[PDB]
Amino acid sequence: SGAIYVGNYRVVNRHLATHNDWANLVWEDSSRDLLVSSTTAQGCDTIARCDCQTGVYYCSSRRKHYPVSFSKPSLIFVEASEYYPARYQSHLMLAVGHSEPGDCGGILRCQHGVVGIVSTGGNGLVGFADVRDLLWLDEE
């Protein structure tokens, strides 16, 4: 699990969104595994606006924060899971590292702020849904 809180927005994995998140929906994209909902309280996170390829992510199945190199966001084939059939997932960044399904929501960050959240895994690679192109998260 995990979320990003920026301004009056909550960013979560689409597959883990709650009924309140759907009732207060702002934007969602199934092909990205992302959902943003509105909040009453202001958040404290900053979204990175950069093209960094190194940062650190939180891995709950290890209780550890790992420094990693990751690929730029791309369209990649992802095998079927408990939440989606096999399909192409867009805006997905990959790194060599450990992850398990319950690690989804773990934040990847660079020196500029939040890069994305854990979304996929397999083949010894952890995939992260990019949020740096969602410029509207910084305003209203």
Ligand X SMILES: Cn1nc(C(=O)NCCc2cocn2)c2ccccc2c1=O
Cα gap 6→80, rounded to integer Å: 31
Q: Which is nearer to ligand X, 103 or 137 (CB)?
A: 103
Instruction: Check if 104 is active-site.
Output: yes
User: Which residue among 101, 111, 133, 138 contacts ligand X (CB under 6 A)?
Assistant: 101
Instruction: Check if 59 is active-site.
Output: no
69 φ/ψ angles, rounded to the nearest 5 degrees? -100, 140
32, 91 Cβ separation under 8 angstroms: yes
Cα gap 70→57, rounded to integer Å: 11
62 φ/ψ angles, rounded to the nearest 5 degrees? -125, -10
User: Which residue among 3, 6, 110, 120 contacts ligand X (CB under 6 A)?
Assistant: 120
Q: Which of residues 31-60 bind Zn ion (CB under 5 A)?
A: 48, 50, 52
Q: Which of 21, 33, 103, 130 is catalytic?
A: 33
Note whether 110 binds Zn ion by CB under 5 A. yes
* Residue 112 binding target from Zn ion, ligand X, none, CB below 5 to 8 Å by type: Zn ion
Instruction: Check if 45 is active-site.
Output: no
111, 67 Cβ separation under 8 angstroms: no
12, 21 Cβ separation under 8 angstroms: yes
Nearest distance, CB of residue 138 and ligand X, angstroms: 26
By CB under 5 A, name the binding residues for Zn ion.
48, 50, 52, 110, 112
